Amino acid sequence: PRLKVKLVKSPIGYPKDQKAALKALGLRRLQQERVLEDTPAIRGNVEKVAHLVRVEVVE
Amino acid sequence: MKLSDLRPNPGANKRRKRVGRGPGSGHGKTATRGHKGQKSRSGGLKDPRRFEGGRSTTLMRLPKRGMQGQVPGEIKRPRYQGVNLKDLARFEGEVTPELLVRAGLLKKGYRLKILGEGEAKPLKVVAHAFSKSALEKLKAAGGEPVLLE
Amino acid sequence: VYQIPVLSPSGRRELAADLPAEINPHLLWEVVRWQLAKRRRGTASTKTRGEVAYSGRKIWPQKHTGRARHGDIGAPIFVGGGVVFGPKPRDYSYTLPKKVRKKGLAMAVADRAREGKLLLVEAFAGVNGKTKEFLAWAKEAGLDGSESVLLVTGNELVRRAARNLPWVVTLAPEGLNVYDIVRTERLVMDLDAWEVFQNRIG
Amino acid sequence: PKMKTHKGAKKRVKITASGKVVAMKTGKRHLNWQKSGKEIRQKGRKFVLAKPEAERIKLLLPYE
RNA sequence: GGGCCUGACUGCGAGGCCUGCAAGCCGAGCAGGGGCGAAAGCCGGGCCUAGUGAACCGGUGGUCCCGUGUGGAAGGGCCAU
RNA sequence: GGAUGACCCCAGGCGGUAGGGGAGCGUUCCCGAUGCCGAUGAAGGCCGACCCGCGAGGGCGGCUGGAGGUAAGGGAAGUGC
RNA sequence: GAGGGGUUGUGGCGUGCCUAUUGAAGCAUGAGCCGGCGACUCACGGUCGUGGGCGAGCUUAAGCCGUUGAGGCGGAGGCGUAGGGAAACCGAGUCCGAACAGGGCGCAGCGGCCGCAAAGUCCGCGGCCGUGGACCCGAAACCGGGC
RNA sequence: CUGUUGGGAAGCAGCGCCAGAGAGGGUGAAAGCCCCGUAGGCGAAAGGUGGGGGGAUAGGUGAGGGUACCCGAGUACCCCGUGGUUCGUGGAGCCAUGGGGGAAUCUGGGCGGACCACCGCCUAAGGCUAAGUACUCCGGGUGACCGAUAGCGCACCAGUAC
RNA sequence: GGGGGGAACCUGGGGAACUGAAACAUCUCAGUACCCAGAGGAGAGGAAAGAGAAAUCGACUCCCUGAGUAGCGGCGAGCGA
Numbered sequence A: 001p002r003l004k005v006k007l008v009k010s011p012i013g014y015p016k017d018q019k020a021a022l023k024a025l026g027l028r029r030l031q032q033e034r035v036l037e038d039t040p041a042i043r044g045n046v047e048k049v050a051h052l053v054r055v056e057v058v059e
Numbered sequence B: 001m002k003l004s005d006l007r008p009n010p011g012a013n014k015r016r017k018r019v020g021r022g023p024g025s026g027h028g029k030t031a032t033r034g035h036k037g038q039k040s041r042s043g044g045l046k047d048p049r050r051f052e053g054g055r056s057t058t059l060m061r062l063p064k065r066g067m068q069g070q071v072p073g074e075i076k077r078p079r080y081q082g083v084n085l086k087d088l089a090r091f092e093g094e095v096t097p098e099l100l101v102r103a104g105l106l107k108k109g110y111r112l113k114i115l116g117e118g119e120a121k122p123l124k125v126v127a128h129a130f131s132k133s134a135l136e137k138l139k140a141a142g143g144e145p146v147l148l149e
Numbered sequence C: 001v002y003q004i005p006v007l008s009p010s011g012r013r014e015l016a017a018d019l020p021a022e023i024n025p026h027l028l029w030e031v032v033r034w035q036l037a038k039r040r041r042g043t044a045s046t047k048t049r050g051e052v053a054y055s056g057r058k059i060w061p062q063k064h065t066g067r068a069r070h071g072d073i074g075a076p077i078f079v080g081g082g083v084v085f086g087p088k089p090r091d092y093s094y095t096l097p098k099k100v101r102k103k104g105l106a107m108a109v110a111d112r113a114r115e116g117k118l119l120l121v122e123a124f125a126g127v128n129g130k131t132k133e134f135l136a137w138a139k140e141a142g143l144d145g146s147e148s149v150l151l152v153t154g155n156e157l158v159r160r161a162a163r164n165l166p167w168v169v170t171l172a173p174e175g176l177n178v179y180d181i182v183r184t185e186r187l188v189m190d191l192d193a194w195e196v197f198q199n200r201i202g
Numbered sequence D: 001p002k003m004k005t006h007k008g009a010k011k012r013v014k015i016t017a018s019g020k021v022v023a024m025k026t027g028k029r030h031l032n033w034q035k036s037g038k039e040i041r042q043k044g045r046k047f048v049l050a051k052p053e054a055e056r057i058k059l060l061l062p063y064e
Numbered sequence E: 001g002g003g004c005c006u007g008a009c010u011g012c013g014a015g016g017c018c019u020g021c022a023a024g025c026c027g028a029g030c031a032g033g034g035g036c037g038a039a040a041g042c043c044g045g046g047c048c049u050a051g052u053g054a055a056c057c058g059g060u061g062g063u064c065c066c067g068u069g070u071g072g073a074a075g076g077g078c079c080a081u
Numbered sequence F: 001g002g003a004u005g006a007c008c009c010c011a012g013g014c015g016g017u018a019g020g021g022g023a024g025c026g027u028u029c030c031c032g033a034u035g036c037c038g039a040u041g042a043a044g045g046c047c048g049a050c051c052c053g054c055g056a057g058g059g060c061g062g063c064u065g066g067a068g069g070u071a072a073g074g075g076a077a078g079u080g081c
Numbered sequence G: 001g002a003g004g005g006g007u008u009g010u011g012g013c014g015u016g017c018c019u020a021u022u023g024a025a026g027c028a029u030g031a032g033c034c035g036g037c038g039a040c041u042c043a044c045g046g047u048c049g050u051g052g053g054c055g056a057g058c059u060u061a062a063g064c065c066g067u068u069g070a071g072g073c074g075g076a077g078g079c080g081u082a083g084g085g086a087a088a089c090c091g092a093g094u095c096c097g098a099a100c101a102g103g104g105c106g107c108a109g110c111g112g113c114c115g116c117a118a119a120g121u122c123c124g125c126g127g128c129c130g131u132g133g134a135c136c137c138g139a140a141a142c143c144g145g146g147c
Numbered sequence H: 001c002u003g004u005u006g007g008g009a010a011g012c013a014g015c016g017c018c019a020g021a022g023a024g025g026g027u028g029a030a031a032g033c034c035c036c037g038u039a040g041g042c043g044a045a046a047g048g049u050g051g052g053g054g055g056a057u058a059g060g061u062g063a064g065g066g067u068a069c070c071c072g073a074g075u076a077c078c079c080c081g082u083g084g085u086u087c088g089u090g091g092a093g094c095c096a097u098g099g100g101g102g103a104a105u106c107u108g109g110g111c112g113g114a115c116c117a118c119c120g121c122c123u124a125a126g127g128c129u130a131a132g133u134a135c136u137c138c139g140g141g142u143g144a145c146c147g148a149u150a151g152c153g154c155a156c157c158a159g160u161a162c
Numbered sequence I: 001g002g003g004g005g006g007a008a009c010c011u012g013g014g015g016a017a018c019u020g021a022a023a024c025a026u027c028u029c030a031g032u033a034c035c036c037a038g039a040g041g042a043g044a045g046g047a048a049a050g051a052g053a054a055a056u057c058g059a060c061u062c063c064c065u066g067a068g069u070a071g072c073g074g075c076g077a078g079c080g081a
C-alpha cells in the first residue's frame, strides 16, 4: 500500500527538524500532495510532521 | 419438507428429442435427416472438421512453421512460470515457491518468476527470477528480493 | 441462530447451533438424485446381433427367390434376433461435489429445525437392546409412533432396540445423509452424534 | 475414447489468447525470384483465418 | 531521342478493391541508405489488363536460435532462394 | 388492467414439404410405499348415444374377468408401427 | 324414451394410402388381411446451451475406512490464474526491425467494509460433433481355419 | 385368539402379544405372532483346505595388509540382413538376432539417442522366487434386469426333432 | 515320469483380410481373427551390464495419473510411449 500525504498546516514556528522532514517528504507548498511508498523510513518522517500533515492510504 | 416436495428447478431437467416417432412430433419418418444422401446414412459423413469433398484441404494448404522436434523428444530444460505482484497481495512475511503452489498460483515442477503487474508490498520474496520492472517496484516498496539458483 | 431442544433428566434444555436459514430445495434434490443413482445395480443387459447364438450364414441368396433379402437370422429384424441399442451393464454413479453434499447435509437438518421436528437427547435411560425398552423410552420422550423417526446414535445397543419398528430408521452418525433425513418426519440424535454432525459441516 | 489432437493443425497453426487462429501466409515457399519485395515481405507475416475455417481447426485442437 | 544512373530498394504499411475459403489487386505515409533534378518533386520495375502452381518432401547461401548428463559435433529451426 | 398465470379488456398474427423451436399425452421400471385401492372384485378383455381435454388421452357406467394395482410430486428408459 | 341410435331412397360434392419425384388417382414403388417383433442408443472425449455449488480459485483419480441400498477419507493429478516468439529469451507486454518507427498477437463489475453479481471451475440436464457397428435391414466380394 | 362376510380370511371388527426377528416366500383372499424362514446364535467322526498361529529344519555371519588366481564365449564387439520400441532409414542410439569376422577378466566390460572427450549409472552372455493382476465351466448373494415372439439356441425329455 | 481333457483367462511359435486412407502400393485394420505348442489355478514378469539428469531413484506385476503429452506418420489417414 502507498501513501497520499497532504501539507495542511504551516511549519512556521516549528523546530528546524520538522521543517526538514518536509524536505525529505518533498512537501514544499501548502495543500500540495505527494504520493509516496509506505516505507518505515518514509513512515517515520510522516509521523514526525503528523500534526501538520494529512495522510490517506491509497493502495 | 418430505420427498414428494423434492423437485428440480424449472429447466434443470429437460426431456430428450425423440426422432422417427410419428407425424405429429415434427420428427417423424426421416428423423430430421432430410432426404437421401451420405449424411442421411447410418454412418454419415467424413469428419466435418477436416474433409472438404476431395479438394486439397483448408488446413493442409497452409504451411508448417517452426521446430517440431525429433526423437528422443523434448529436451529437459528449466521451466519458468510467472506470477504477478498483484497476486502476492494476500501474503504476509515471507513468499516462496512452495507457498505459492499451496494457494494455487504457482504450478509444481515450475520455477518461480515474479512479474510486475500490480503493486509491490514490503515482503521478503524468494524467487528464481524477477522482471526488471518487478525488481524496481519491489526495492522501492520496502520489499526484499531474494534470487535463488 | 436456531434453538434446538434437548431432552434430559435435568431439563428440556435449549441448545443453539448455527444451521443455514436459507434452504435450497433444488440442491437437496441434487443430493438425493446422486444418493439414489449411485446405489443402482446396472445389471440390465441384452444381446447384440453379434452376441446371439445363430450362425452368420446368408439364409437364402440375395436375388431371384421372390423373398426379401436377408443376411443372418441374428439380425434384429427377426423374431429371436439381437436387440438394437439394448441396455448394457452401466455405472450410474458420479461425483457430486463435496460442498454440495456437505451443505445439503446442513440444509436437511435445518429444515427439521425450522419445524420443531429436530430433537436431541443426552442419553437413553433404560434401553439396552430390547425393543420393549426403547418403546417405553420413546413414549416418555414423546415419540409414540405417529411420526416416522430417523434415529442417529453411535450406541449399538440403542440402534438394535429400535431398528425393527416400522416407523424408525436407525443410523450411526457417520452414516447421516440427506435422503434418510428427508425420508422421515422427525430427527433424533445423541449429543455425541450432534457433535459428529457439526464436525462434518465445516 | 478421448479425442486426439490433429498434429497437422498443431504444426501449422496457433490459437491466440482470444481464440483467433493465426497461420503463415502462403505463396513464398518457392518461385520467388520474380516476386516483388512487397510480395515477399508481406507473405512473411501471420494472418488471422476466416471465422468458419478457424472454428473447424479449433475443434481439432481440444487440449491447447 | 539523349545524359546521368540501378527505386527491377531494405525495414514497414493508414485505408481500400475483389471475395465462400485460400488467393489476387491498388496503395499514401514514416525510417534506413540511395538515383535523377537548380527546384517543385519523381523513383518499392516495365501504358494497363495474360506470361502462372497451394502444401508436403528435399537442395543451396546466410543466421548462430535449439543441440537429449556437460563441452562440442550430428540433425533441425529461422531469413533468402 | 392486476401485480405477476388468478383472470379480464382491446388490437394483430395463426396455408405449409425439407427443417428449427415449444408444450403435452401414453407405455415399462424406481422413490413416495412396513403406505394406499382390492373378493362389496386387481390387471386385462367387451360395450357406451355419458362427462373432462384442442388433441394424444383421462374418467364414469354396464358386462366379462378372478388377483393383483398403485396417487399427488419427482426419477430412469429395450417407450408409441 | 321439442331429444338420440341403426338403416339408406333421392339429391349435391368427391382422383385410395405410402414411397419417390419437376410433376402420381395415377397404367411408377410397396402392401392379401389381422395380431405380435421391428430402426437415432451407450461409453469416453468435445462444443454450445441450461439448473445448481464454490469463486482467484474450482475439483479430486486409483485407493483406504465405514455401510450392507450410509456415507466419508484420499490433492497424486487436471482446468483456470499471462501473454508474445520457430526458439534462446523477455513479460503486461512481446514479435518483426537499426528504430525509442509502423504493424500483428496481447494487457484494463453493481450498489449502502459487507451484501449483489462475476473470470473460472465442479456436478446434473439438453442439442450437436469425434471415436466406436453409431438409426435399422440388404450385397456382389476379400481373408483365415476346417469339411 | 374371538366374532363377522365369504367356497376360503390372512379382509373388516373387539381385545391382545413378540421384536438383535416388520427380508422374503407360502397357506382357499390381503398374516410380524399358522407354515417355511428372518435377527441372533450353534455344528464334523470323515475328506479337503489351511495364505493365519506355533514348532522343527535347510540355509544366513568379521577386519585389515598382501598376491593379481577367478568372476558365465563362437559371447561381447564391429559389419551385413531384420525385428522390438513412439521411432515407417531418420542425426537412429537402446533391447533381440539369421550371416561373416571375433575379444578381454576389473587397469575387465555394457549404458546415458550417431560420434569424441569429460562426468556419472550399471555389472551381460546360468537358474528360481510368493503376494498384488486376469478369467468364470462350478457354488452362493443381489438387481430403477427379461417375463414364454421376451430372457440362453432350450422355463417343456434341446444341441433334441428336422 | 510322460501321453489326453478342461468355459473363458495366460505365455510362447507362426499369422490374414475385408476395412480406413472417401481410388491405392508405404501406412491402417493388427501382431487383431485364426492355427499350433505349452502352462496352472492362474499364467507372464521379477532382484539392474535398469532408469536418465533428480548431484536422483532402487526387483517385478497391477490400478490411477503423467498424456492424447513426448514423439512417430505417403508429417496423409492416423499411430502413440
Ligand SMILES: NC(=[NH2+])NCCC[C@H](N)C(=O)O
Pocket: C159, C163, C164, C170, C171, C172
Ligand atoms: N446400524 C445400522 N446400519 N442401521 C441401519 C439399519 C440396518 C438394516 N438395513 C436394518 O434395516 O435393520
Ligand SMILES: [Mg+2]
Pocket: A012, A013
Ligand atoms: Mg505559528
Ligand SMILES: [Mg+2]
Pocket: A017
Ligand atoms: Mg535532531
Ligand SMILES: [Mg+2]
Pocket: B014, B015, B016
Ligand atoms: Mg433425462
Ligand SMILES: [Mg+2]
Pocket: B015, B016, B017, B018
Ligand atoms: Mg421425450
Ligand SMILES: [Mg+2]
Pocket: B016
Ligand atoms: Mg441423449
Ligand SMILES: [Mg+2]
Pocket: B016, B017
Ligand atoms: Mg423439445
Ligand SMILES: [Mg+2]
Pocket: B019, B020, B021, B031, G039
Ligand atoms: Mg426411428
Ligand SMILES: [Mg+2]
Pocket: B021, B022, B023, B024, B025, B026, B028
Ligand atoms: Mg408423432
Ligand SMILES: [Mg+2]
Pocket: B025, B026, B027, F021
Ligand atoms: Mg421440433
Ligand SMILES: [Mg+2]
Pocket: B026
Ligand atoms: Mg416438418
Ligand SMILES: [Mg+2]
Pocket: B029
Ligand atoms: Mg413415412
Ligand SMILES: [Mg+2]
Pocket: B032, B033
Ligand atoms: Mg436436423
Ligand SMILES: [Mg+2]
Pocket: B017, B032
Ligand atoms: Mg436434432
Ligand SMILES: [Mg+2]
Pocket: B032, B033
Ligand atoms: Mg441430424
Ligand SMILES: [Mg+2]
Pocket: B030, B033, B034, B035, B036, B037, B040
Ligand atoms: Mg432421407
